[PDB]
Structure formats: C-alpha cells, structure tokens
C-alpha cells in the first residue's frame, strides 16, 4: 500500500501523461511536416529539419513503449457495498486529518452497490481527503472537511455534476472550507505533476491519480468550487446489479 | 516477484530511457537554436520553430517528471555469500531450462562475499537464462548453457572483460552454445525496448533490467561473443569485507 500503490500510482500518471504528451507531440509534427514543406531538399535549413523530425521519431517511441508498459497493471474488480467502504476508510480519516479539522461524514438512504478495485477508490478517496486537508490549514479552527456519500437518481446526477447520467448512480463528495479553486487553474488540475505548491511540498501526482481511478471505474468525476468558497470534489460511479 | 520485480523491471527501463531520451534530446535542441538563429522574428518560419521550441519544453518537462518518479525504487542491499546464492538459483535455472538445454554449473575456489539486494540479482541471472535458453531453440540436443560463478584477482578481471579493477572481483558468468550476438547488434543489446525476436515475443526490457542492476550495484557487466561461436555474458561485482 506505500509500495503496491506506488506501483498504483505510476499506472494512473503513465496513463495521463501518455495523453498530455500525445496532445503535444500532434502539435510537433503540424509544424515540422510544415516547415519541412516550405525548406525542402535543396534548402539548407532541411538537414536540420530532417534530423530533428527523425530523431524525434526515435525519441517519442522510446517514450511511448515506457508509458505503455509503465501501465500494464492489475486490478480486482470486486462489488462492493458503498456505505461500508466509506465506513472503513473512517479510520483512516480520522487518524490523518486530527489536530484541529472538523470531519463531518454523511451517509445517504439506499446505499448502492458499486463495481471497483476495493484498494483503488482508498487511494481516491484519501488524496482527495489529504487535499482537503491542506486546503484548510489557514483556518485554522474553521478547518471543516466534510465527506458525504450518498444515492442519486438519473436527474440528481446531471445537476449535482455529471450530464452523461444512463440511470441511476453512487456518489461520494469530499467538499472542504478552504479557499477554493480559481477558475485559472480549474483546468490545469487533473494534469499530470501539476501543482501550486512549492517544489519540495507539492508533486502534483494526487488528482491526477483520482483522475485516473475514477475513469478507470467507468466513472465521471466533476467540481464545482467557486473563490474564496472552498473546494467540493465529487465522484459518480454507476450502480451495480446481477 | 511478478508483481513487485514488474515494478523493479519499470525502476531499470525508466533509468534507462531517461539515458537515451537526453540524449537524442540534446541533438533536437542544438539543430533546433540552431535554426531560430537562422530564422529569428522576422522570418516566416520563426513561429513555426519557435512554437516547437516552447511545446517541445512542455513535452520533455512532463516525460522528465514522470521518468524521475518512475525510478524512486526500493533495494536492500544485503551482504550474500556468491555461492550460496547461486545454489539456490539452481532450482528456478533448473526449472526453466529441462527439455532438452543441457545445463553446467562452475563454483569457483574461494568464493567471494557481495554487497547486493538479493532479489535484483536472481532477476539479472534469471534474464539472462531466459536468454541463453531462447539463442539455443536452434540445437535441438546441442542447446548447451553454462553458467560460471567464480572468484578473480585485479589482473584476471581485465582479461576476461572488467578493465577498471581496483583490486578483486566476484564474477558471474551465463555463456551458452547459440548462434551468437552479431557486431551489428552488439552495441544496441542492453537499449531498452531493443530487440530481434518479432514484435508478439520480444519486448526488448530483459537486459536493460541487467545493465541496470549491474550498473546499480557499483558493477560492470561485459560480453565476448563471436558470430557462430554462442553468446557470454558476464557480471563484475566489488568483493566485500567490514
Ligand atoms: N481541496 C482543495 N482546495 C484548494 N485547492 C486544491 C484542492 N485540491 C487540489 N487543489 C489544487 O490542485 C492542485 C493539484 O492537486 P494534487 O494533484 O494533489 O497536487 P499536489 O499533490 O501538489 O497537492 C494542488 O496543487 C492545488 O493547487
Ligand atoms: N544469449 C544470447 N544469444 C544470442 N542473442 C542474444 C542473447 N541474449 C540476447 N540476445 C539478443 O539481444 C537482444 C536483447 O535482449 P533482451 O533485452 O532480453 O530482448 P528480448 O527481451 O526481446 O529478448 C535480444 O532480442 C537478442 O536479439
Ligand atoms: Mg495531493
Ligand atoms: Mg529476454
């Protein structure tokens, strides 16, 4: 669990980059098959253009055969009751937040079954909370994470977040006091390494690895925060029945 | 150790990617500030050039961050009595060898103590079983792998392969009697994603996990092979006393 899920966590990363890096490499080759249109063969500037274009080649392909063996990693989908999940997970909770953060959890009526790897959404749900956690620390005794499983019929989905809603479906939200998300970096959030904490604090791992689960569990994951209002990150997962 | 020496396996090709990687990086760089000089603000190409320049700073950063992380992996180097190891070994070289490969096993005179993670070497040894079983499907009845634990004074190291020896030196050794490693091939063998054997067999990961573990225990690794005459690889490990 601190190395099988370092092991976790490369997989979510890898997979994330893989998309960023194929996104910019696109942009690359535009340009370059441009330019090599307008310096062709006989311009001096085409050696250059041409060796760059074919050690790039070489250079992305290394890359892509890592990300893509970096993935290639295992998960037990098991069904699991969603409010006794969440009740285990407590402990943990708990025993990270103490100090002064007011915990407040909230378990709805009609607890679903949910389809996931047990170790998987642990890790979701404790870098969200970890988050949550950091978020708060300026109010210092206002800090208040509050966590609120719960049911949501195929309406209460598309309002509360989540617009692609088949039927009905489980939902977890871990919300926070803090100063909440500016709409500049709403965006940039779920990206790979990044981070506005500094250098030796932040890594910028965390969101992108709950990106990942959340996607990897057939889920939709979506926020609403607004300034100075505090952070509320949620998770839609689809209900399971057999 | 299908699990945890598949996380080891990513800790090696991470390490050696970022090796190549920075440098075909290198080579796109120089070309590419060689050519804005050509180019500058003015000229057509200009944006173009630059556009890559500034997207190819984001592309690298994020393969950096995720090679970096990638790596951060976990040894144990213990104090192993080089024969001892070997012995045990013996079962899993048994194991997957039979069938036909004849197999001969070398313990040297006075066999040295070794600082390393136990469990990195057995992966080393075991690659290069595979190997050496693999370069001898050709003999059916002649496929004949040896391998050959043994002790070496500073001189005797140079010879056989290790031409930085302070003093002593432990030596591992798997030859076999395959079709051997072409001059061709012989520099590009431990690249990651390297190899001969088509696209569904081959992955080319087996000896850059060797050359990274080697590397990783203060060791040299070095290959005489001749074309027809079978491959031989060698591990050089520093002696231990305290
Ligand atoms: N609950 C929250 N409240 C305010 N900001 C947040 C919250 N959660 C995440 N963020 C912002 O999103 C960024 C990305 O999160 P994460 O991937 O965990 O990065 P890090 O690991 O450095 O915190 C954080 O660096 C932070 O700037
Ligand atoms: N014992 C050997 N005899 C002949 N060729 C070899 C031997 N070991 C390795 N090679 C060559 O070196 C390449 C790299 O080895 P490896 O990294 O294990 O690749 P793979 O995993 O595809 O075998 C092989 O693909 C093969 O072409
Ligand atoms: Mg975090
Ligand atoms: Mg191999």
Chains 1, 2 share one sequence.
Do not use: C
């Not at 370059?32 to 001096?44: A, S, T």
């Not at 709805?108 to 950091?134: C, F, H, I, W, Y």
């Not at 994470?145 to 809603?165: H, K, M, N, S």
Request: aromatic share 6%.
């Amino acid at each position: 669990l601190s190395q099988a899920q370092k092991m976790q966590a490369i997989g979510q990363l890898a997979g994330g980059v893989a998309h960023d890096f194929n996104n910019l490499l696109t942009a690359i080759q535009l340009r370059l098959d441009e330019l090599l249109h307008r310096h062709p063969v006989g311009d001096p500037s085409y050696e250059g253009l041409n060796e760059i274009r074919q050690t790039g080649v070489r250079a992305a392909d290394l890359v892509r055969k890592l990300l893509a063996f970096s993935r290639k990693q295992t998960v037990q989908r098991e069904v699991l009751d969603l409010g006794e999940l969440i009740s285990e997970f407590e402990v943990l909770l708990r025993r990270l937040l103490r100090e002064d953060v007011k915990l407040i959890t909230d378990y709805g009526r009609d607890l679903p079954q949910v389809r996931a790897d047990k170790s998987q959404l642990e890790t979701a749900v404790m870098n969200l909370a970890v988050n949550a956690r950091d978020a708060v620390r300026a109010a210092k005794g206002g800090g208040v994470v509050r966590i609120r499983t719960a049911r949501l019929t195929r309406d209460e989905a598309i309002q509360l977040g989540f617009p692609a809603a088949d039927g009905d479906t489980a939902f977890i939200e871990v919300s926070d006091d803090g100063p909440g998300i500016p709409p500049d970096v709403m965006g940039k959030i779920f990206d790979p390494f990044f981070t506005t904490k500094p250098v030796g604090e932040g890594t910028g791992l965390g969101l992108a690895t709950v990106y990942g689960i959340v996607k990897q569990s057939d889920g939709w994951i979506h926020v609403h925060s607004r300034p100075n209002e505090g952070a509320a990150f949620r998770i839609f997962l689809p209900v399971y029945e057999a």
